[PDB]
């Protein structure tokens, strides 16, 4: 996260770290959506241009974390993966359309002060909150700059951007399964996701029921925190029918 700040303790208790076993390193962010299911970006697991194709046994999920590198004894919980599910129409060839994946844990994780699931939006909450100017919050342990790495989880709040501005900022083909967020050059403030933040959540706190909803997944961007560029996020609600299909079939 570029131009963010240190998270407060328990600020993002749905935050998940995807952790590579060997070599032991941060792979991606992710989010906890129930005691047995974790949501992330497909490109965190499958991206053939970079020879990335992880299997369940390659990875661990670390939940309840704050420090990036520490083993947070008596706080974090480490889970093994039972199964990975990637969206069947994930477009790794072109533009990361439908950049979404689910991971089922081998065993349920115990909730605590530091571990708690985020809500997924309904049609109404998405329609109400996914509006240009409305801010969400992005969290992760990714790079602090485009070209180092944080001690603890970082957070930044960013406004959703009008679709034509998103489209005009890039040569990549944008789809309805994406939205973009970030400040404009004239808006002064800044901030962005960066490499390592992939798969983490873009969340909004509903002013109607005071619950946090995951509206987006950190997907892609051209550089980090560049003027006139914006971060792109998987549109969770647009892909919710797939999420529900997978959980209903395999849950």
């Amino acid at each position: 996260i570029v131009e963010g700040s240190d998270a407060e303790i328990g600020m993002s208790p749905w935050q998940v770290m995807l952790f590579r076993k060997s070599p032991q390193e941060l792979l991606c962010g992710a989010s906890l959506i129930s005691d047995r299911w974790v949501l992330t970006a497909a490109h965190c697991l499958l991206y053939p241009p970079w020879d990335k194709n992880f299997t369940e046994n390659d990875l661990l999920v670390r939940i309840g974390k704050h420090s990036r590198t520490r083993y947070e004894r008596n706080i974090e919980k480490i889970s093994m993966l039972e199964k990975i599910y990637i969206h069947p129409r994930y477009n790794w060839r072109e533009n990361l359309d439908r950049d979404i994946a689910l991971m089922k844990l081998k065993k349920p994780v115990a909730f605590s002060d530091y571990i708690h699931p985020v809500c997924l939006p309904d049609r109404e909450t998405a329609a109400s909150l996914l509006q240009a100017g409305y801010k969400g919050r992005v969290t992760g342990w990714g790079n602090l700059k485009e070209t180092g790495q944080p001690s603890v989880l970082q957070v930044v709040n960013l406004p959703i951007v009008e679709r034509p501005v998103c489209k005009d900022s890039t040569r990549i083909r944008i789809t309805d399964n994406m939205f973009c967020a970030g400040y404009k050059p004239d808006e002064g403030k800044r901030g962005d996701a960066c490499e390592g933040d992939s798969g983490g959540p873009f969340v909004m706190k509903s002013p109607f029921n005071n619950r946090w909803y995951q509206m987006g997944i950190v997907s892609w961007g051209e550089g980090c925190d560049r003027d006139g560029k914006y971060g792109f996020y998987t549109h969770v609600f647009r892909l919710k029918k797939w999420i529900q299909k997978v959980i209903d079939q395999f849950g």
């Binding site: 076993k21 032991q24 390193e25 941060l26 661990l60 590198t69 520490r70 083993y71 480490i78 093994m80």
Partner: peptide, 11 residues
């Protein structure tokens, strides 16, 4: 970099 995690999670 990363602190070693308990071996139970790598077995």
């Amino acid at each position: 970099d990363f602190e070693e995690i308990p071996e139970e999670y790598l077995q």
